Design a protein around this ligand. Structure first.
Ligand SMILES: C1CC(Cc2nc(C3CC3)no2)CCN1
Length: 171
């Protein structure tokens, strides 16, 4: 059976207990922590691409009100995010299983951009999700996995100073 695991869940859970925030810029900002995934149960000889997207966890705008994140009352439908292709893609199962798959180069933006960068809505809450796409073979297949531990709110600047502190302490 194909098994997908979060590397450094310990650390992600410290960010999650505070409500995690990720900066978005016009040019795009890399994530900290970086999403790293442990994968086993691939066919070492089969071909795969690793895709990353961000699900809008709810339909609301969030605001940091008197030291606490609170959702607005005017939900809007959220269009799905674009997909980031892991730059090692396409690659053999053996490649993907030999070390954690690290999405260190994805950049989060707030502006429709040349590409590479993934556009998010500021002050929305996101749940990172990967797709493992078996390619080249006759039987195309997709396995998807969400990472609740890695939920964050997209922000143009950190609201919760405890997040600011954690980000520096562990970088
Ligand atoms: C150029 C190359 C890239 C190749 C590609 N992979 C996929 C699916 C299997 C993951 N679709 O296209 C397309 C975007 N930029």
């Amino acid at each position: 059976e194909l098994r997908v695991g979060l590397e450094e869940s310990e650390l992600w859970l410290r960010f999650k207990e505070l409500t995690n925030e990720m900066i978005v810029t016009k040019n795009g900002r890399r994530m900290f922590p970086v999403l790293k995934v442990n994968v086993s149960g691939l066919d070492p000889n089969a071909m795969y691409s690793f895709l990353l997207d961000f699900v809008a966890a709810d339909n609301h705008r969030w605001k940091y009100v008197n030291g606490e994140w609170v959702p607005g009352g005017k939900p809007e439908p959220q269009a799905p995010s674009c997909v980031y292709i892991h730059p090692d893609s396409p690659n053999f199962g053996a490649h993907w299983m030999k070390a954690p798959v690290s999405f260190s180069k994805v950049k989060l933006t707030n502006k429709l951009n040349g590409g590479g960068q993934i556009m998010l809505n500021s002050l929305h809450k996101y749940e990172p999700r990967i797709h493992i796409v078996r390619v080249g073979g006759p039987q195309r297949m997709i396995t998807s996995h969400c990472f609740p531990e890695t939920q964050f709110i997209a922000v143009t600047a950190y609201q919760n100073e405890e997040i600011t502190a954690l980000k520096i302490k562990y970088n």
